[PDB]
């Protein structure tokens, strides 16, 4: 059975919204900007602890949701609105919400429910929730602690809170694979469709991990950028010469899988079809990948294998490049490993988006599954921002898109790798 | 392509090893005792912070894994030794070391290394390493945060772990689904080997979050036994009249799954054929299963149709029931609605094992799957503990098992449901 997308979510730092996230993706827009006390996410602690915490942060920088009633805002009055409700999970219902619209899928019927499944993951949950709490005990303040507290910071609540609002009965699953985990959701959620276990999946990552603790840990793996604290705009810079981490950023991105021929006696317009979820593992150290990108390289070519298209028929490829310096660099060696000549030629086009929104972590793949479909609908590929001095592994042909560029794209591949060494690639078509 | 099982492997409160958990379950013991300030995890805090808060635990009981140098006992020094292996991280790797070794499967050719995976989640991670972290902002003292941090808390590290420790290079994948995360674990592996993404798949589910927060937060939600803590042992109680709350446990569960072909070429030795894996959401409350149990109905029925099997034809069912009143409740009916006439015969065997092992969480569905894998190899059902008053709801035909049954078992049905109404159902027979 082949599974189509038929409906699109998202709630990013360009903008609550798929229409909005994307036509300032294109036209070159940046979500980052510098952190502030009110960031930490440390409501509960006084003045003093807030100033001395910040200053502990190296890394200073981050790719924040549009708060707001107002139109391409996250409106929290109306998705946070549950004490059960971290908000990892309200990005979550947000985007899905907006995805089940656009596919116009919104079922009463119980037969249409029971056939209809939820994968939306979530990479690391609410750390600042578990910090309120641990703050009780540090304090001995237990009787504040809520009976909510373990249900929202569960890392499958999102998926739960989709299926209890739409009453979906149909698979109720999360994939959790760090940076990875929107990719494996959707990726899961397709073998789901094409085994049977459902008809429509509604399938993604969210992830809003921006706190104090959060912050300190990914700067302590010295994971983050902080080079540019001064000039946050040019902190994410993929593939640049002087990229020195990524920067963290938070959102959400749903999608609606469904059977090819289920799609088509609704009459439900077909954004693309999901071909490939290639998998794999380096296997070779927690957060370092191999220096010749071997696992990467096993991602994309499973990819290919699964679709039964060659290298050379692929035209876009959204690169995970997170604006790492070794990270990006191998990702480069392994695209050039995969496609040869096609890319070394100049022919295929590649870029990372994350100079625009930062790293969503778990919900990355899930945000870069939708702008590959995206590309493959408007035939337009996203730029790469803050590309001054290409890495010294480019050229005059090899090199990653450096402005929004109007071609045709029939088929785009999405790369996902997190710590562990679990990588991903999503592979989609125009059908 | 069938996928059957040739590897076992597990720690759990009842011994480290296979051997000594299913000696031990099937001989009546139990795994749970009383908690004491030590159990807590809060090495880093005074004595005064630590005797208020085991003061505010209503529940002081939990089920831990034996350590020790001693045959089946866990060895913290063989799987706890660097810094970056968080306890739900070593006894994965534990049990998976033993799962591989039964399987005898470590492969030195890149292609069975390439086409061997790992899908073994955790449910909740590390919340202790997170309340230290946490401490060290109340106590200005973030210098000293491990740079290990992040690696430590991601709930997919087990799985990273595993691979590169064997150079597995197959999907490095983890499914979190809270109660169900060993079940749905095992399922996705299943899928992928199915479809052809792998030819083996080391899957299950870890944890280990026995600790302050972790204590507190469960028991603020009034899931947890509260009224034996002068008496652990009869804490546990699935099916009984008194039972009033799950027991946190410990552990880990690890089965190598492997394409049926693959298997008989290299002439490995096999267990059984996972022939259906069900899911479902309720879709009705975050930590409530609905009375008439659909979701419970619809996993178990969705892994029988999987398998082509009628009710009749199964003779054992490893059941959730996690001695909760209304949980326990519900899955009985289900169960009854599912297997009407061959439950109310009396021939069908069902029990729960968590009287003994106490809750595992995300490993719950793992260590549980092979329990009723164990049932189908070695011709026992395991029995119910501390059934001294069955619930109303059964009989003297329709009751749960309270011995250990000698017995044939051709098939087995492992039930897994977790908060946010996530169901899995895991249904094995004899090849
Ligand atoms: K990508
Ligand atoms: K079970």
Request: net charge negative; proline share 4%; glycine share 10%.
């Amino acid at each position: 059975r082949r599974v189509v997308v038929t409906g699109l979510g998202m709630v990013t730092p360009l903008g609550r919204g798929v229409e909005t996230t994307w036509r300032r993706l294109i036209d070159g827009e940046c979500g980052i900007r510098g952190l502030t006390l009110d960031d930490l996410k440390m409501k509960s602690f006084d003045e003093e602890t807030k100033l001395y915490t910040f200053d502990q942060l190296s890394s200073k920088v981050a790719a924040f949701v549009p708060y707001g009633s107002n139109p391409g805002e996250f409106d929290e009055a109306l998705w946070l609105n549950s004490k059960a409700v971290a908000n990892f999970i309200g990005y979550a219902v947000c985007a899905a919400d907006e995805a089940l619209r656009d596919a116009e899928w919104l079922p009463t019927e119980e037969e249409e429910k029971e056939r209809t499944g939820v994968s939306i993951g979530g990479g690391i949950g609410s750390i600042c929730d578990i910090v309120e709490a641990a703050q009780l005990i540090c304090e001995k303040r237990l009787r504040r602690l809520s009976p909510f507290f373990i249900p929202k910071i569960l890392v499958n609540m999102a998926s739960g809170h989709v299926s209890m609002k739409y009453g979906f009965q149909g698979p109720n699953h999360a994939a959790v694979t760090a940076c990875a985990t929107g990719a494996h959701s959707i990726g899961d959620a397709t073998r789901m469709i094409q085994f049977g276990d459902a008809d429509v999946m509604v399938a993604g990552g969210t992830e809003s991990s921006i706190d104090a603790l959060s912050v300190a840990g990914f700067s302590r793996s010295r994971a983050l950028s902080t080079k540019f604290n001064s000039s946050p705009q040019e902190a994410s810079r993929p593939f640049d010469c002087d990229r020195d981490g990524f920067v963290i950023g938070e959102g959400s991105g749903v999608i609606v899988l469904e059977e090819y021929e289920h799609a088509k006696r609704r009459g439900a317009k077909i954004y693309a079809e999901l071909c490939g979820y290639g998998m794999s593992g380096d296997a070779h150290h927690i957060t370092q990948p191999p220096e010749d990108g071997k696992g990467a390289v096993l991602a994309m070519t499973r990819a290919l294998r699964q679709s039964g298209l060659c290298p050379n028929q692929i035209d876009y490829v959204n690169a995970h490049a997170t604006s790492t310096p070794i990270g990006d660099a191998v990702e480069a060696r392994a695209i050039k490993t995969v496609f040869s000549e096609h890319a070394t030629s100049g022919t295929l086009a590649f870029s990372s988006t994350k100079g625009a929104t930062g790293h969503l972590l778990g919900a990355a793949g899930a945000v870069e599954a939708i702008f590959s479909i995206l590309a493959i609908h408007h035939g337009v590929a996203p730029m790469t921002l803050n590309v001054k001095n290409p890495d010294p592994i480019f050229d005059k042909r090899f090199m990653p898109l450096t402005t929004s560029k109007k071609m045709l794209v029939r088929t785009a591949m999405s790369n996902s790798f997190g710590f562990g060494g679990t990588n991903a690639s999503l592979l989609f078509a125009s059908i």
